[PDB]
């Protein structure tokens, strides 16, 4: 295989109720569009929650975001070695790691589980990947009822998604309720009926 | 806003001064690919597909976090020791699958808007604490530079037993209990 890499964190300039805490964060954000034809590296330097200095591959140099990192951004731009290595991580980190997303992440397709159960009627569409999904409610002769309540796309945090659409209708003794679900992992849509 | 098809976070480097703790993890589209056990120097991938094909040297985390610790000391003095301000978390409990008694499921306790990333998350079954079947996600990054951690509890749904997710944070004046019942 190929060992993946992360963006390197540039070194800095200088050589009563709850306990106090001081947080530092570094974020190496790679942005991809239309494969690797449009890649962009944005490294974020955070103190607590304040982004003070960042590198943007569209800019090419370190720019200070808040008055907290004019010293740092001007220090990393004067060091030619830090600049050439940060500009190179667009290929060294972003383009390099994306090759293994094509082999693993971008091929993941988990089929959703579609169940209907009273709470009125709730169609639970759970455990699917990726995020794109389309859930319609139908009553009897292809009546796409619009009076529905759907949650936002729920991220379970284990590489699976979940969405719970709810339909409020007056069911007569001869109606039929079907949940129509579409997902990129499905060659044909999943339909689940009800009385 | 940066419009992209896929937003990767190849390096969620975190270091905080409280009980010198830190975290290294890569994210893709908001999902944690792996984290690095900085104690054991081990790369823990979060999918069998990742363990089978993906590789990452855990030494990179220990090297990068060592610089995180250095940069933190310089901004502490530069910011006049501006300490982090606590946030009130957003705790939500729900199930991964529709719950039917006798058929096993797992309870998902989402704790959003975590800052600073110091939290205690417990599952309570009829008042008593749960020990078995409890997994936990790393602190995931957010665009506002706060975090959200998700805890998991695999359980056997019984109408007799009820469950509560207990969350303790400095931004809370009291431990937050979120109840869930079949």
């Amino acid at each position, epitope marked *: *295989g*190929q*060992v*993946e*890499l992360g963006g*390197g964190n540039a*070194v800095e300039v200088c*050589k009563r109720d709850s306990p106090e805490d001081f947080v530092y964060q570094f974020k190496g954000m790679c942005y991809f569009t239309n494969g690797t034809e449009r890649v962009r590296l944005v490294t974020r330097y955070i103190y607590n929650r304040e982004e003070y200095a960042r590198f943007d591959s569209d800019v090419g140099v370190y720019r200070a975001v808040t008055p907290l990192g004019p010293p740092a951004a001007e220090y990393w731009n004067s*060091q030619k*070695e*830090v600049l*050439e*290595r940060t500009r*190179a991580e667009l*290929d*060294t980190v972003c383009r*390099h790691n994306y090759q293994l997303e094509l082999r693993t992440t971008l091929q993941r397709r988990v089929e959703p589980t579609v169940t209907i159960s009273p709470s009125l009627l709730v169609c639970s569409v759970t455990d699917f990947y990726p995020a794109q999904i389309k859930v319609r409610w139908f009553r009897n002769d292809q009546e796409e009822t619009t009076g529905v309540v759907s949650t936002p796309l729920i991220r379970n945090g284990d590489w699976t998604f979940q969405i719970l659409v709810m339909l409020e209708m007056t069911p007569q003794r001869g109606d039929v309720y079907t949940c129509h679900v579409e997902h990129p992992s499905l060659q044909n849509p999943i339909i689940v009926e009800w009385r | 806003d940066i419009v992209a098809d896929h937003v990767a976070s190849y390096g969620v480097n975190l270091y905080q001064s409280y009980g010198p703790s830190g975290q290294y993890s890569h994210e893709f589209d908001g999902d944690e690919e792996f984290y690095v056990d900085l104690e054991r120097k081990e790369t823990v991938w979060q999918l069998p597909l990742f363990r089978r094909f993906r*590789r990452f*040297d*855990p*030494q*990179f*985390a*220990l*090297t990068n976090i*060592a*610089v995180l*610790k*250095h940069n933190l000391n310089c901004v502490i003095k530069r910011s006049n020791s501006t300490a982090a301000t606590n946030e009130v978390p957003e705790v939500t409990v729900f199930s991964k699958s529709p719950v039917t008694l006798g058929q096993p499921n797992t309870l998902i306790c989402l704790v959003d808007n975590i800052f600073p990333p110091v939290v205690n998350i417990t599952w309570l079954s009829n008042g008593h604490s749960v020990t078995e079947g409890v997994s936990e996600t790393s602190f995931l990054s957010k665009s506002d530079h706060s975090f959200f951690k998700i805890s998991y509890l695999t359980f056997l749904p019984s109408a007799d037993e009820i469950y509560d997710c207990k969350v303790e944070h400095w931004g809370l004046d009291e431990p937050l209990l979120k109840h869930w019942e079949p």
Partner: T-cell receptor
Amino acid sequence: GVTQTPRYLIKTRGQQVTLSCSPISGHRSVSWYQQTPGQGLQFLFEYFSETQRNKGNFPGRFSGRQFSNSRSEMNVSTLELGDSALYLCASSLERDGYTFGSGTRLTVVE
Amino acid sequence: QVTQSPEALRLQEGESSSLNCSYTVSGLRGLFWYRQDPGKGPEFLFTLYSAGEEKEKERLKATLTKKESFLHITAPKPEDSATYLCAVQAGGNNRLAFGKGNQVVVIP
């Protein structure tokens, strides 16, 4: 520039040596290396902010430390005839660009 | 690891030549070229990050590919006689995996 002390040193078997290296002003990382014939340049360990951040495949008797002035020492306990080498020292800002010093020439004699 | 060819290279003054450095590492962070006199320490030359990158300094030129790296010499002088060392940096360790060098001797 990078300074290494001493330039030449002689010691017998079983004894120890301590080699010093002052990096370039403004630099925080110090890498140690061993240059032997037949084995070439071999990485000892790297020090950053007074702790060993990276290490090589040398045994435990190859140790060192780093001080507040980013200056580093390396110590070699229980010397050996195979330990005779030129011990180089690379100075770095932290990760990008490594400037080697003149080196310490150590010769272990029976 | 990494290997450089040829190990020795004696050439008369004025004739151009090329040095080779073939590496096999996973997660390359940068390839380094160095120059070393026998008693001295290594002198820095180049640092190549991406494939197809060309960086030229004085009578030297460093090229990087996905499999190897070339260090071309143009009209060398007797001072150019030195052990040219090639190093790679890969993975999470900031160490330098040096090759065995090219003992270059340029005769006047």
